[PDB]
């Protein structure tokens, strides 16, 4: 009853550098990947050699990592490649950076990265003609500042979940960084039926990994190990930035508001509001 793991890993050099600033500069993500590096090997050793895949989201964009994109054309010799082969690309990609890259931080390629895996999952899944492979992906992030929360990625991420459900592929996320729990993600894992652990940075979390992230693939008879409640009072009033529970969704615009609206022209859709109806809101 094999499966497939598809790690998704960001590399935010700012955050990765900020990772040195975060806590101590006592060993950056270089620690992390190391911890990850072996973690796969278990997953390989785990099932009847069920395959894996890694995709990374660098600054200017993203890149598959393990599946060895068309390039030419010890450790049980099957492990030994997988990592040290991938490691090349992580280094080869690690070569890819400079301030011109460092200038266009206008977004985080995280969200698009997630998508690609799903595609990739489907790519395998749709070709998975024989002995269909249940599968799950996994995320990690050096959650740091310079964007307390990007908001554009809201939508596309959520489109992932709907797909994930339909693809029946759970996700899992392991955020390490500032004490800022990405509801977005936390919602995602919950909806995707995964786990989440905003643990600190220092530890070599292999201890976490095996425990907290070996569970789903096919097993899933078993208690999740998530954190406390995942309050789903979703995105703040876009007009304000005030997280909403007594919402105000406009209309065909679908924007989310508070009692703020200017009475006209939804502040995402140029739609003057029904003034009589707008007044009817004042009925209290």
């Amino acid at each position: 009853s094999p499966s497939l793991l598809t790690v998704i890993i960001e590399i935010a050099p700012k955050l990765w550098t900020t990772f040195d600033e975060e806590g101590n500069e006592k060993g950056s993500i270089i620690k992390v990947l190391e911890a990850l590096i072996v973690f796969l090997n278990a997953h390989l050793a785990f099932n009847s050699a069920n395959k894996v895949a890694v995709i990374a989201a660098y600054s200017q964009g993203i890149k598959y990592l393990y599946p060895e994109s068309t390039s030419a054309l010890x450790x049980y010799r099957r492990f030994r490649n997988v990592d040290e082969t991938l490691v090349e690309e992580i280094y080869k990609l690690f070569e890819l950076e400079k301030k011109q890259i460092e200038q266009n931080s206008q977004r985080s390629t995280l969200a698009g990265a997630m998508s690609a895996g799903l595609t990739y999952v489907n790519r395998i899944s749709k070709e998975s003609v024989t002995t269909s492979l249940k599968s799950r992906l996994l995320v990690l992030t050096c959650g740091s500042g310079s964007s307390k929360d990007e908001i554009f990625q809201y939508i596309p991420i959520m489109n992932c979940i709907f797909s994930a459900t339909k693809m029946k592929c759970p996700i899992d996320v392991v955020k390490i960084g500032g004490s800022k729990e990405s509801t977005f993600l936390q919602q995602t894992t919950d909806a995707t039926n995964g786990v989440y652990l905003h643990v600190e940075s220092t530890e070599g979390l292999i201890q976490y990994l095996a425990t907290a992230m070996f569970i789903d693939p096919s097993l899933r008879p078993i208690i999740v190990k998530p954190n406390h409640g995942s309050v789903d009072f979703r995105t703040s009033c876009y007009l304000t930035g005030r997280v909403v529970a007594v919402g105000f969704i406009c209309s065909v615009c679908l924007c989310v508001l508070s009692i703020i609206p200017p009475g006209n022209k939804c502040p995402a859709c140029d739609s003057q509001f029904d003034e009589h109806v707008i007044a009817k809101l004042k009925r209290k």
């Binding site: 278990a42 049980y76 292999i206 097993l219 008879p221 208690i223």
Partner: protein, 461 residues
């Protein structure tokens, strides 16, 4: 399924601990375990502090938590772990030898054995030996099955078969034909064929040079990968060499000639723990390799074929007229008597035939099935899924041919009252002798030789 695990656990810990040195085995056996085991093993794999028990039970929620037992039984059954009921709890940890035997392997330890494969100039071709053993690996089936080609010439191999005695044929005349084991020999092709045999090596493996790790390691080292050289030159104990000689003799090993080299890793070793794609002069393509026709017209319907599996399939049906890619052979009420002439029910036949030869019967599984899966409650009268019509007739003929049971020995007769029966015959049904337990019979039955607990207690009543 003999569940080699079962053979594995038979031994006591010191031997188990003996073996856990060879890391790959630890990994190999890791694959064997049920997933929970695999799971919790990791949970303990990287925390060097023995751990309580309920916690683990507190890992699992409801239904499925029985597997916990099925898990914990297993690991305890082979005692990989070491319990510690010091503080009333169960402080648990793996056999650390084994645990480190894994960890070292898991993160590039000092595993010279599991990493014994010293790669070299790869002189291996895909078709190169692709049947080079497969011939010997196939011919042995025929030689075992009994055919034109002496594919079963291995004196040791034959002596193995004779020692293994799993085949029902006249060893006095030399035959070791399809017994139930022979029928089973027909049954478990790859996983069955390999493992079902492999123990025979151990079965014969009792006299000299125990060296089980040097034995077992020679297996899973083979089970590791096609490292070719670097071991067959030196990196193998003499027990390995004999095993190497045996492995090539068993065919299961891709050792070339010249008796001085590291043998290639024949595909068999992959197949040994594959449970995956298994198929593989120059014409070697499947699935149609096994080609035949299944239907309720009681005949051979063969365009494609496995030029031995045919005669194997013949083992329940008379060959009448061989042709190039077809043969006239009527598999009928008459033909089935042969599988019963050997004796084995062709019940294994059913799914196997419902599984095999469908390559030539792919339009069949739709001329017959129509995917009659969801229309099940819409029609009171399904259609031939899976085709039972002959199978019913088979099942009919099954009893109809068999239709008897015979016993022999003495006969205990006309007992006294309901203890020797409901004290020591449900107890004979509790010490395993009886060849009949008819309560009111007052008479009971065994096989003559089998009394060591049968003329013993009824006397006491």
């Amino acid at each position: 399924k003999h569940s080699v695990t079962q053979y594995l656990e038979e031994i006591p810990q010191q031997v188990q601990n003996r073996l856990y040195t060879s890391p790959a085995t630890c990994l190999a056996i890791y694959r064997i375990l049920p997933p929970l085991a695999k799971f919790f093993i990791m949970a303990m794999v990287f925390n060097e502090n023995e751990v309580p028990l309920l916690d683990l039970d507190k890992w699992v929620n409801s239904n499925g938590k029985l597997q916990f037992q099925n898990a914990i039984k297993s690991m305890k059954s082979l005692h990989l772990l070491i319990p510690n009921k010091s503080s009333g709890t169960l402080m648990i940890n793996l056999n650390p030898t084994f645990k480190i035997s894994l960890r070292n392997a898991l993160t590039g330890g000092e595993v010279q054995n599991s990493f014994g494969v010293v790669v070299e100039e790869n002189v291996v071709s895909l078709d190169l030996l692709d049947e080079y053993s497969a011939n010997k690996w196939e011919t042995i089936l025929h030689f075992m099955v009994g055919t034109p080609l002496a594919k079963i010439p291995s004196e040791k191999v034959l002596n193995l078969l004779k020692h293994s005695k799993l085949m029902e044929e006249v060893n006095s005349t030399g035959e070791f034909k399809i017994t139930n084991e022979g029928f089973q020999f027909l049954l478990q092709e790859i996983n069955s064929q390999l493992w079902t045999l492999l123990l025979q090596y151990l079965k014969m493996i009792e006299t000299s040079k125990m060296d089980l790790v040097d034995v077992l390691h020679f297996i899973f080292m083979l089970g590791a990968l096609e490292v070719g050289k670097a071991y067959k030159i030196d990196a193998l104990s003499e027990t390995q060499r004999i095993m190497l000689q045996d492995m090539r003799d068993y065919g299961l090993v891709f050792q070339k000639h010249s008796n001085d080299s590291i043998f290639y890793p024949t595909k068999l070793a992959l197949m040994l723990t594959s449970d995956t794609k298994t198929i593989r002069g120059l014409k070697n393509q499947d699935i149609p390799d096994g080609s035949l026709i299944v239907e309720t017209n009681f005949k051979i319907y063969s365009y494609s074929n496995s030029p031995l599996q045919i005669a194997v399939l013949s083992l329940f049906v008379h060959l009448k007229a061989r042709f190039v890619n077809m043969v006239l052979g009527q598999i009928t009420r008459e033909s089935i008597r042969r599988a019963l002439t050997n004796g084995i029910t062709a019940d294994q036949i059913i799914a196997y035939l419902e599984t095999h030869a469908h390559p030539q019967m792919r339009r069949l599984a739709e001329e017959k099935l129509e995917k009659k899966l969801e229309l099940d409650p819409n029609c009171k009268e399904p259609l031939q899924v899976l085709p039972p019509t002959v199978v019913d007739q088979i099942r009919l003929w099954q009893l109809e041919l068999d239709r008897v049971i015979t016993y022999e020995g003495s006969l205990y007769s006309d007992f006294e009252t309901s203890q020797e029966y409901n004290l020591l015959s449900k107890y004979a049904q509790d010490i395993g002798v009886l060849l009949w337990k008819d309560d009111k019979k007052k008479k009971f039955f065994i096989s003559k030789e089998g009394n060591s607990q049968v003329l013993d207690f009824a006397k006491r009543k």
